[PDB]
């Protein structure tokens, strides 16, 4: 070493989905919901497996309320005080499932996590996000959380390789968050030169996780519905959206609108603005209501299935044949 | 699966046509007309095989009138009332061959289609356009239209693979419309991640269709005459132009001028304006087309001369005295970028 | 078939020149002149083998006068009247070698060509430019011009393949003009979809021509000195510049100034080449770059450049 | 001839670093310092191996003062008069190690170089920069400097191939400056068509140098910390920054301000503004006549440094290298499409 990996890793861009013979009625005959039985928490899931990322500007209760109307999952950002949770939980009883409480490895975070899980029981999911998901320190933090909440479904990331995927599933995690570099506000590649193309990561990781009867989440990398579809077809059980959800009303950030061409604030989770307030800080153009964007995404996914012959999202990858595009 | 296909599919951009020794006089000695004998309708065709797409903004009678002056085909959009057809057919007797009536799988559409074919018996061509040309529901619908009009030449699409090409040809269609994703106002790839590079599609499909003694239409993907040339050389029997024809006088769209620059709208068969402007029944017609803007091009008149002109040169350059020989003489060179 | 060619043809952009160990003093110890003995006209050449393209806006006498100060060749555009030639020839006796009279296959053209060659015997070069250099109508015409002027060095193009290169050399031409598509004001690819990457063309054609003891000219495709260097290293005997020379004082076109900057029309497509001022500097800039290329590769003479060339493939750059 | 090289050379852009399981605490548990024992000068080094390029606008004493606070090396541009050196050396006693005196092959240059090395013996590094580092001439100049200062660590460049790397190491140089073309103000490729992708160059050259127990410097090509990281992982012992350091306060160039934004001129070593500003003798200093450009004013280098070192620290955490030495040893490059 250093040695170069012969096989070229490809991204969503380098690929397309080949249409296939089917018997599907209309795009409406498509069921975008899925039933999962998590390996470790032994719990069950049901709903459209698209998650709003646990970023300050995206994982907001205001956001969760809408995604809930469509059965979409939400990983609430790790900032809301125990009070807002109880408040939200109060005004939105039903939308408590399909919601995850986030947390880092930090003691403060873990203590703020317990507090919330103890207070609101309707929340059976935990979202663990460390800097380097390949850190032994993380593997242990994961186990610990496993023991302390043996019946909560655990989402832990991020990684981009099958190996660390298995390690984490065995050390206790239920869903592994796949993705390093391809994020919108994410800039690992510029600042560290470390990364891994989403598509190749998802395919490789999804495979690993599935062998252990576990699941993965395609975290970051999507800019359009097609990518989300590509992600699902690649094997992702859940697709987590960050930037694609930023810039809406229900979204976070300051509506610092420029010459008609309005721009809302969008800081990463470890950004310069997140640090100073509690990663790049960018201006996502105001997109209005998430309401439509969700209909637009689910809409696209529905078509993808029709085109491929999958009556239900579960059949999507099973019927997926990726074609390689020049550019 | 999933499985990634090893072979990289390439587009018009990834390729060029290699010049070849010939004995051609001048670009004028080139005949861009073709004679076809359709497999199922058993009918015959003759004219330049370039079709104006059946999009609201392109497949207009106003457009058809001009293309007619040059022998180009027109797939009239699925909106004109039986009256306008009647009118058009009236004022332009001759231009009724080389004209196709379009339709979706919807009952309303099919009833409106019959009405037109019964009324104007010069329109011998039908253009069937479904969302997913891979659905059995389409194969089915095609079968029906075949029976109901056993002697009309049927154009049905779209697909991008030889298999579904054969399926449709056997199911009764005469010409298969090839193309998914590459369209201008088309955005299948962005919204669904589904697509297929035009060049590879055309080559693969053209081959399939030809084996069953059928034909194909390269639908969408062309932005310049060279692409149309590339398409023909790739084996396409007909090349259908959409965006390349949008933005003209005879074209449709709103003259939404901007910054001392005259533009024109471009959406098509499945967009928000298609849904808005149509009584309903277009949602599953094509992805949901993007309503893009196209700078005002003036008269199609020129553009046509510009296209036919380019195709003529392509043939001169390759040694094809007639379009029929273009692909026969085509050798594609791969470009790095 | 129709078949796709497996081997990917690459352009100047897809490649670079690998530095090499040498004993060269300074960039000044580099000789950019070359001696050629043309296969058919049996004539001889000597000077820097870079030619100003025979385009209306580039192959001007005004341009030729300057390039002459540096030993560069000029293919005069086929428009100047027999009078201007006689005048130019008059005021610039010496600059008559390293000058070519251009012409198409058209009878009118050939007539005007004769008149000029007859009137000015100090011009020993003809530049034949047809639309499709692959047409038999051209091979023939070439054969004719050969007979009618058995001792003039003939430049004929364009083509992009070794085959047609040989055909033309045997048909009588001395230098084959290589290039279809890559031109600046050239837009063959957009309108016809026909073309061929310069680098691959030059390499392939240069090889062909050289086997028959003939020569080629890399016509079009260069945008910077490095490209010209790349072309020479690729095997081109002469490099013909069109756009890179447009937009100067001595250049043609109309100085259509806009929004604060000065531009000029370049003529296919009609494009605006921002006014660059005097060709004078551009020439020194080009020769300069070629000189460095040789130093870095170890070629003391332009003749050794390709001999010492190893192209590295680049992802981009 | 000529022939095209089959193997495609790739740049920093065509690649990424694959994360790896590790036992690292936090990004803080990473040591970015390295100990080197130079092959010829037999001297020793210790500090963070990132060097500020010896360009007029970057290798300034003002710059050196700050980089010194972080243990970064500085190749002082070859213009400062013997007086300024004296002064700098005076007011900043400690910051003399980790500083190199630059010079071209020109007599004037060498004459000036001696004068500085004699006056300030605390300066134990020499930076030799010729136009074409492949000229047998340079090789000789190198051998001469070796003899005249048998105990100074010599940095000589630039080249991009293992062969010339060995030649130079054997002729006497300690560190070989790798890089031709990829520079910011560098424009070798546009004017000469000559170049070589940084990544491939560094890997190939680093290997060569290391076999002879020598070292290399990745010169130019970096635009972000990730590139610097990529360079180190690729095998570079030192990474020299030019453009990434231009446009700061401590930087050189003219502090222009236009359209409400403040900038700084960033001219090359052989640029036109260099030849016109310099006394003479810089025309063959670097492989091409550099372009003068406007780098947007970046403020204090102070921060940029913390930002770079910061990024490198993360790269190591991600890969499992506790010490910068282990970075390449643990590096696996994933080839990327885009
Ligand atoms: N490395 C890094 N990743 C971030 C940061 N902020 C957000 N992310 C990642 O970006 C993901 C969303 O990606 P997106 O949908 O915007 O392409 C989040 O789920 C998270 O994993 C950050 O500041 N640094
Ligand atoms: N998926 C999709 N395709 C469309 C839509 N409108 C037009 N198209 C396709 O785009 C083709 C024209 O492509 P173009 O010549 O603009 O590149 C039309 O012939 C039709 O096949 C649409 O709304 N959705
Ligand atoms: N060829 C050439 N290289 C230069 C010139 N000026 C600076 N350089 C190179 O640019 C390198 C720094 O590259 P950067 O950090 O801007 O990408 C310097 O170390 C030096 O080797 C110049 O004028 N010509």
């Amino acid at each position: 070493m250093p040695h170069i990996d012969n096989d070229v890793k490809l991204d969503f861009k380098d690929v397309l989905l080949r249409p296939k013979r089917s018997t599907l009625k209309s795009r409406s005959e498509v069921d975008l919901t899925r039933s999962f039985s998590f390996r470790n928490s032994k719990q069950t899931y049901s709903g459209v497996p698209i998650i709003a990322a646990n970023m300050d500007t995206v994982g907001t209760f205001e956001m969760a309320k809408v995604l809930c109307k469509f059965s979409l999952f939400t990983a609430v950002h790790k900032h809301y005080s125990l009070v807002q949770w109880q408040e939200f939980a109060g005004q939105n009883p039903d939308c408590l499932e399909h919601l995850a409480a986030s947390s880092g490895t930090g003691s403060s975070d873990f203590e703020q996590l317990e507090q919330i899980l103890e207070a609101i029981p309707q929340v059976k999911y935990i979202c663990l996000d460390v800097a380097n998901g390949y850190s032994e320190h993380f593997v242990e933090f994961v186990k610990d959380v496993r023991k302390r909440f043996p019946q909560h479904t655990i989402m832990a990331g991020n990684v981009v390789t099958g190996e660390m995927v298995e390690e984490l599933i065995l050390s206790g995690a239920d869903i592994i968050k796949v993705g390093i570099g391809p994020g919108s506000v994410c800039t690992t590649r510029k600042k560290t030169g470390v990364g891994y193309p989403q598509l190749s990561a998802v395919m490789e990781c999804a495979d690993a996780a599935h062998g252990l009867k576990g699941h993965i989440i395609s975290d970051g990398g999507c800019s359009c519905p097609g990518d989300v579809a590509k992600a699902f077809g690649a094997g992702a059980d859940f697709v987590m959206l960050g930037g694609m959800l930023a810039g809406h009303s229900e979204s976070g950030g300051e509506l610092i609108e420029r010459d008609g061409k309005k721009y809302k604030l969008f800081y990463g989770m470890s950004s310069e603005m997140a640090m100073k307030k509690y990663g790049k800080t960018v201006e996502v153009p105001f997109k209005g209501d998430v309401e439509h964007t969700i209909r637009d995404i689910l809409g696209g996914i529905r078509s993808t299935c029709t085109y491929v012959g999958a009556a239900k999202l579960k059949e999507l990858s099973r019927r997926t044949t990726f074609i390689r595009v020049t550019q």
Side-chain angles (χ1 to χ4, degrees), chain A residues 28 30-34 36-42:
Chain A
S28 56
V30 182
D31 189 1
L32 295 175
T33 49
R34 291 206 66 179
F36 291 125
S37 46
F38 306 122
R39 180 190 145 96
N40 299 324
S41 69
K42 300 292 187 173

Side-chain angles (χ1 to χ4, degrees), chain A residues 31-34 36-64:
Chain A
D31 189 1
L32 295 175
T33 49
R34 291 206 66 179
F36 291 125
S37 46
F38 306 122
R39 180 190 145 96
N40 299 324
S41 69
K42 300 292 187 173
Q43 308 297 230
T44 290
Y45 168 84
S46 190
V48 194
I50 300 175
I51 315 167
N54 64 313
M55 295 188 267
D56 306 85
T57 41
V58 182
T60 72
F61 285 126
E62 301 73 45
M63 176 79 68

Side-chain angles (χ1 to χ4, degrees), chain A residues 54 78 100-105 110 113 125-129 138 141-146 153-158 173 175 177:
Chain A
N54 64 313
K78 78 196 76 183
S102 311
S103 171
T105 63
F110 183 49
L113 175 58
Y125 296 94
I126 300 175
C127 194
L128 304 171
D129 280 284
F138 189 57
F141 175 69
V142 177
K143 290 168 176 169
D144 293 330
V145 177
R146 173 79 286 170
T153 308
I154 300 177
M155 292 173 188
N158 291 44
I175 330 273
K177 297 240 287 56

Side-chain angles (χ1 to χ4, degrees), chain A residues 31-34 36-64 66-68 70-80 82-85 88-90 92-95 97-106 109-110 113-114 116-119 121-123 125-129 131-134 136 138-139 141-146 148-183 186-189 191-212 214-253 258-260 263-264 266-271 273-275 279 281 283 285-310:
Chain A
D31 189 1
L32 295 175
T33 49
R34 291 206 66 179
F36 291 125
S37 46
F38 306 122
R39 180 190 145 96
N40 299 324
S41 69
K42 300 292 187 173
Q43 308 297 230
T44 290
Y45 168 84
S46 190
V48 194
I50 300 175
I51 315 167
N54 64 313
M55 295 188 267
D56 306 85
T57 41
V58 182
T60 72
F61 285 126
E62 301 73 45
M63 176 79 68
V66 188
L67 300 195
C68 177
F70 296 84
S71 296
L72 306 207
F73 207 104
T74 303
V76 185
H77 66 65
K78 78 196 76 183
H79 275 47
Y80 286 128
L82 197 162
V83 180
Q84 295 99 117
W85 275 95
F88 179 75
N92 302 288
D94 20 45
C95 303
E97 49 169 41
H98 298 174
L99 209 53
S102 311
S103 171
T105 63
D109 281 41
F110 183 49
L113 175 58
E114 281 181 342
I116 301 184
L117 288 178
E118 297 294 8
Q122 291 259 58
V123 178
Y125 296 94
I126 300 175
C127 194
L128 304 171
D129 280 284
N132 176 26
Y134 287 69
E136 217 56 78
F138 189 57
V139 186
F141 175 69
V142 177
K143 290 168 176 169
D144 293 330
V145 177
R146 173 79 286 170
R148 227 258 92 168
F149 305 80
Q151 307 192 107
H152 275 73
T153 308
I154 300 177
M155 292 173 188
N158 291 44
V159 304
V160 296
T161 316
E163 27 110 36
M164 193 54 83
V165 166
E166 305 178 312
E167 178 77 335
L168 294 174
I169 284 183
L170 295 178
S171 293
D174 293 291
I175 330 273
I176 309 315
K177 297 240 287 56
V178 169
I180 300 179
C186 169
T187 45
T188 309
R189 288 183 290 198
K191 290 167 178 176
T192 72
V194 174
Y196 211 92
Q198 259 318 76
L199 189 77
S200 291
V202 168
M203 282 198 279
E204 287 166 34
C205 293
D207 219 59
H210 295 167
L212 294 179
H215 311 291
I216 65 163
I217 293 180
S218 179
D219 195 31
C222 293
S223 37
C224 45
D227 290 320
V228 186
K230 288 177 181 170
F232 277 136
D237 303 291
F238 294 88
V239 170
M240 187 183 275
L241 303 180
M244 279 188 65
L245 288 179
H248 292 73
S249 301
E250 304 86 325
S251 191
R258 179 142 62 183
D259 358 296
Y263 290 82
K264 200 155 191 180
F266 181 65
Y267 47 119
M269 282 158 69
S270 301
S271 66
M273 167 142 76
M275 288 186 206
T281 312
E283 271 167 42
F286 185 59
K287 314 177 170 191
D289 284 345
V290 196
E291 157 71 344
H292 325 299
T293 293
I294 299 309
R295 287 199 181 127
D296 198 75
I297 297 169
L298 307 174
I301 309 297
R302 257 192 279 281
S303 300
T304 306
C305 297
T306 296
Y307 284 85
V308 165

Side-chain angles (χ1 to χ4, degrees), chain A residues 6-12 14-24:
Chain A
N6 305 163
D7 180 62
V8 173
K9 276 37 192 165
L10 22 66
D11 260 294
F12 297 152
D14 305 306
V15 94
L16 281 184
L17 285 118
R18 152 156 173 35
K20 295 184 174 186
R21 293 190 46 178
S22 68
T23 48
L24 299 202

